[PDB]
Every structure is written in C-alpha cells, then in structure tokens.
C-alpha cells in the first residue's frame, strides 16, 4: 500500500499520518496539508510532508500523478461551528477538494478515503440509534456539502467503479492536535481546563448526548474499513460509533480520574444548536458486520489516558 | 412584483417567461440566459431580454443590481442523460449557478424558486406515491446535485432568512419545444413521430410509469407558489405531480385521439436506466394543503393540445 493523506496535519490527518508511517513505513506514505508544520507539530522534521493547496487542482494531480498512491485518505474540510461564520470557504473547500480528488482517484486508480460525519444528519435524521439509511436534513452548511460528499463519491464508484469508502465520523476525541472549529471541540478543552485547573467555559449544553469516539478506536476503524475486500462492503458509507456523552458526563468522568471538584460553567455557544440537530447515538451494525469495526475504549479508559497524555505531549501540570 | 429569470429561453423559461410578462406586465420582468434567442424563437426581437452567463457573478449582480428584482426563478441546470456524459459541465453550472443565485437572494433581498426534481430520489425513495420526505439515493450527477441545491437552499432560509421557495417537477411536456434526446423526451418524439406517421424510436420501457406534467400546470402552479404567503409555507422543497403515465399509456392517448394506429419501437437507450431508477408516481398533498396546488389536464386532454399545436409550430403535417 503506498498511501497519501491530504489535510494530514489536522486533528485526524496527525495521528493518522504518524499511524500509517509506523505501519506501513515511512517510505510508503506521503503526507500533504495547505500549510507547513509549526516547531512543535508531531509530524514537523519529518520526510515526506508535503505543502499543497488541494484547491491548486494542477498541484494535487501532480502530486499524485509523481507519488502513484494506491490509497488515499482525503481529510480537508471546513467543519461545523466555523463553516457557518465563513461558509464561502466551506463551500470552496468541501465540494471543489472533494471534486478533484474523486477525479484523480478514477484517473489514476486510487482506492480513497473520505471521511462523512454525523454532521450529514439533521433533525428529521431519527436521532436515536440512527440508522445508516434515513432522511438527510443537516442544518449547517458543513453538513450540507458533506451530504454532497456521500452523494458524489457513490455515483463515482456506480459510474466509473472508482473504490470509495467513507464513515460518518462522530466527535473524535484526542490530545496530540488541538481541534478545528467543530462542535466537539469543548470535550478536549475540558481535559486541559481540568489540568490547568482553570474556569472551563462550556459551550456545549450539560446533557447534550452525542456520539464520540477515542482515536486509537478511530484510527483503528480507518484501516480496517480500507484493508477491506471491496466484495465485502454492501454500500460506500457507514455509521460508526465509540460511545455517546454528554458534557457533565465527561465532567463527572474527569472528575473520577482526578480527585477534584472542577468547575465549568455552561455559557450557551453556537456550537449548542449545532450538537442539538444531531443524533444522541448511531447504529453501526453494518459496519461491524461488513467489515469488523470495533471500540476497546470506554469514556473512563478515554479520560485515564487523556489526562495522562496531554501533560506530556503538551506539558500541563502532570500527575 | 418585479421578476428575474435565469436561463430563461430552455423548455420551461419560455413558456414561464411568456406567462410571466403577461400577468404581471412586460416591464415587470427580465429574462436572461447565456444564449441568445433564435429568431424563430418565442422571445425573439422582445423587449426585457438579456444575455448572461451565470457562472459569472459579477455581471449576475449587476444584472441584479441594474434591475433591481423582488423575485427570481432561476432555471440553468444540465439535466440527466447529458449530465452523465458531461460531469463536469453538470457539477459547474448546477452546484455554482446555484450558489451565486442564492447568495444575491440574500444580499438583495430576492424571492428565490430553484427547481429540484424527482431525479433527486434513487431506488430507496419509496417509488409508489414518493413522499416529501425520504431516503435520497441519486444514482444520476444530476440528481445529486438537485439533492446539494435543495439542501444549500434550505439552509440558506434558516441561516440567512432568505425566502427559498422550491419543487420538485416530475416530467415536464411541452409543444413550444423539439424533441431532444432527454430522458422523457420520448414522449415529444412519439407526438412528432405520430403527426409524421413515422416510427417512434422508444429508449424507455413500455410500462416505465413516471410522474409527469402538462406546461398548462407547471406553469400555473410555479406562480402559485411563489405567489403564496410565507406564513402557509409549511416546507422549502414540494413534490407536484400532474399525473404519471408510461409510455403504453401515452401510446394507447395518442391512439384514441389519432383513431388510427401509431407503431412504437421500444428499445434500450441511456434513458430507461436512469428512468427505471426514479419514482412511480408522488404524494403532493403537503403542496395542495398549503398553497393549492392543481392539475387541470389528464393524459387525453394533453395529447388532444399537443397534437394540434405542434404542426402549428414546428411546420409538421396534421389532424
Ligand atoms: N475530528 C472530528 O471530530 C471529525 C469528525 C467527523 C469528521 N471529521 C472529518 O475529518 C476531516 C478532518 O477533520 P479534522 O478534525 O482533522 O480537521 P482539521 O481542521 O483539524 O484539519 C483540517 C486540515 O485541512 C488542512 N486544509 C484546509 N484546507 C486545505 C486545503 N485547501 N488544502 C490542503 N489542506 C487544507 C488544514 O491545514 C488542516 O490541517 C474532515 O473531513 C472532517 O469533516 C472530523
Ligand atoms: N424539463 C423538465 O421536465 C424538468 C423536470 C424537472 C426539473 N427541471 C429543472 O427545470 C429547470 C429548467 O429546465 P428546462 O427543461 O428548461 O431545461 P432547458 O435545458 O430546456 O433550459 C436550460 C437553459 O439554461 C441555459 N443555460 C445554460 N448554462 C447557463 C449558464 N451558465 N448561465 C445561464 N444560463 C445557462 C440554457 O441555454 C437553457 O436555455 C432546470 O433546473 C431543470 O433541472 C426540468
């Protein structure tokens, strides 16, 4: 497998391109984002690390064209909270990336990867073990262009037979790369905000259940479904799920593993609408029949380590 | 009321265009679209008619801004035979044209109708009376990106307030236009065809049924809509329907109207699978109940106005 992951330096892309190297080896994988790693950014120093604009489509093809990947994992996107204060970007980034992508796939034989998300659901969507076919309805532009994403990389596998594959990720829950500017954010700010013992300020409404997920369980899901047999995927896109928390869950979880008695104080954000158009859980069954996803971690196990992480990737008060 | 339409002088823009400035006055109403009428042309010579590019949004805005509408239809969009052989073409102009039609709605405060289409459902959709709200699985660009519009639209009402109005048409017929290789386009060939006395070459199976149309109905009922008060607008996106028939069936209403007999020859063209992928027939009754949708031609009152009228327009041979 010679594997090329683009958006690599983000929350997901981090951990991933570190996962696939160790993998599969150094060599076998080139690792691409629109911007350069900062001192400090785990992949920083490191061989095949490329900068390319996914927008620059004369770029990505030959990137591609000299790399000759057979995998791909296609990460960019503009997500939830900051789609909608700059959605022209979103637009641009999650339809015309994903757009130029899916071709360079077809034209040089790639099997790839692009992530969906819970995101694509919305309201109407039945938010109780929500079923991996139901009503699109999503209520934020993000989730719109990835509805759209689903849409166009299915036809592409029906009408060209290009191999695309992708999960609805739900929040993904880690320490190495601060997140974003999703929804789920506040979980991880929470963790350092125990740390440093600081007012948490939550955005997040206090039982606002969603479904999240602890990225060795999440890293593990994205190679398997792509180690897969294609004859073995009845469809292009699953559900997956860890488990599903609310904010004074994680609150108490943290609160466990600690021995304090920390403070966060719910001030309603843009972020609460969002999370509310959600699904409170998924039904993943189809993935763990096709294709044998599978969680190890629970939300005490995610705290145990999370807390016992970030002080050393990050340098926070430990113990 | 003062109106824009966009790719004005296709199939529906002409008799939308011509019904338009007769109800609200002439000088209520501009058309626009990237070609120019030809001279035998309905729209030919006729003051208010302009010529713009959509993919260009400068001169959209300043056609915009020159003329100053309350409300637009905006009609440009590559549909699904021709879209699976011009993807690229499809993706432009139906998610981009869409895109900067939505945005001058919210910058100058535009009433905005966007059809979508019953290419929007796939094979999921509950092809039997399809309601408004289903699993929605194109299996055509075109459809996938009426699906992107109906949802960018949506979202555009909630987030910005912009009045987006919108329905979904079924197969629309029409004499004022020829017989191009479409997907229900079978049906205009096998009126010319009839007329001709020649043979009709039929791409979609005999007992295909599909929803369909008479331009009498969509045209009453594209105003209707937009005519209606917000506040009985329940929904964005609305299912119409005139009445579904498949090709025996219109065979059997060209028949009782000719008294002759008229030989049809069916065969396979790209037509029949994107056709068998689509619905039966629809449920509109969330658009009656809320503004009042109607039908007022049946198959053999349709056929009886498409037989006259045709010889009249396109020269051909009568009775
Ligand atoms: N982390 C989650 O909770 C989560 C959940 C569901 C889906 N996802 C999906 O995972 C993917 C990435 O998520 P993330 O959280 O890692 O994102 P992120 O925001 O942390 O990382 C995105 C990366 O994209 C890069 N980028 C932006 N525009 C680019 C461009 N034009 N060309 C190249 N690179 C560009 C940025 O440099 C950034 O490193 C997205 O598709 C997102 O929808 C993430
Ligand atoms: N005809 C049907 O039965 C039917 C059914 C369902 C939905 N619709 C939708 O109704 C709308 C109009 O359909 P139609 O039947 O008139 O199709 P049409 O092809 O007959 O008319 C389309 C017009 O768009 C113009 N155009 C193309 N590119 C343009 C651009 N870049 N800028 C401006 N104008 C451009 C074309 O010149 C053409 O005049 C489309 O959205 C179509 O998807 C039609």
Redesign the pocket.
């Not at 390319?52 to 927008?55: F, K, P, T, V």
């Not at 990720?169 to 993904?172: D, S």
């Given at each position: 497998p010679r594997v090329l992951v683009?958006?690599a330096?983000?929350?997901?892309?981090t951990d991933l391109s570190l996962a696939l190297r160790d993998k599969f080896g150094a060599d076998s994988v080139l690792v691409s984002?629109?911007?350069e790693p900062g001192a400090k950014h785990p992949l920083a120093g490191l061989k095949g690390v490329e900068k390319?604009?996914?927008?620059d489509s004369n770029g990505f093809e030959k990137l591609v064209k000299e790399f000759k990947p057979t995998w791909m994992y296609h990460?960019?996107?503009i997500?939830s909270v900051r789609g909608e204060a700059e959605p022209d970007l979103a637009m641009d980034?999650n339809v015309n990336?994903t757009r130029y992508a899916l071709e360079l796939a077809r034209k040089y034989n790639i099997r790839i990867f692009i992530?969906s998300?819970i995101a694509a659901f919305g309201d109407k969507c039945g938010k109780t073990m929500t079923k991996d076919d139901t009503i699109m309805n999503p209520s934020t532009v993000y989730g719109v262009t990835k509805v759209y994403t689903e849409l166009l990389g299915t036809w592409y596998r029906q009408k060209y037979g290009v191999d695309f594959r992708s999960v609805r990720?739900?929040?993904?829950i880690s320490a190495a790369?601060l997140?974003?500017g999703?929804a789920?954010d506040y979980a991880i700010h929470m963790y350092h905000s125990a740390l440093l013992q600081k007012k948490c300020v939550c955005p997040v409404l206090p039982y606002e259940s969603l479904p999240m997920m602890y990225m060795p369980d999440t890293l593990n899901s994205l190679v398997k479904i792509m180690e897969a047999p294609l004859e073995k995927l009845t469809r292009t896109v699953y559900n997956i799920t860890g488990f599903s928390f609310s904010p004074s869950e994680l609150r108490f979880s943290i609160e466990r593993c600690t021995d304090r008695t920390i403070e966060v104080e719910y001030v309603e954000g843009p972020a609460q609408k969002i999370a509310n158009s959600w699904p409170d859980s998924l039904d993943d069954s189809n993935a763990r029949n096709d294709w044998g996803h599978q969680v190890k971690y629970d939300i005490d196990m995610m705290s145990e380590d999370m807390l016992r992480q970030i002080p050393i990737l990050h340098g926070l008060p430990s113990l």
């Open positions: 683009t958006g330096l983000g929350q997901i892309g984002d629109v911007v390319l604009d996914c927008l990460l960019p996107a997500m980034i990336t992530p998300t990720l739900p929040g993904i790369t997140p974003g999703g789920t």
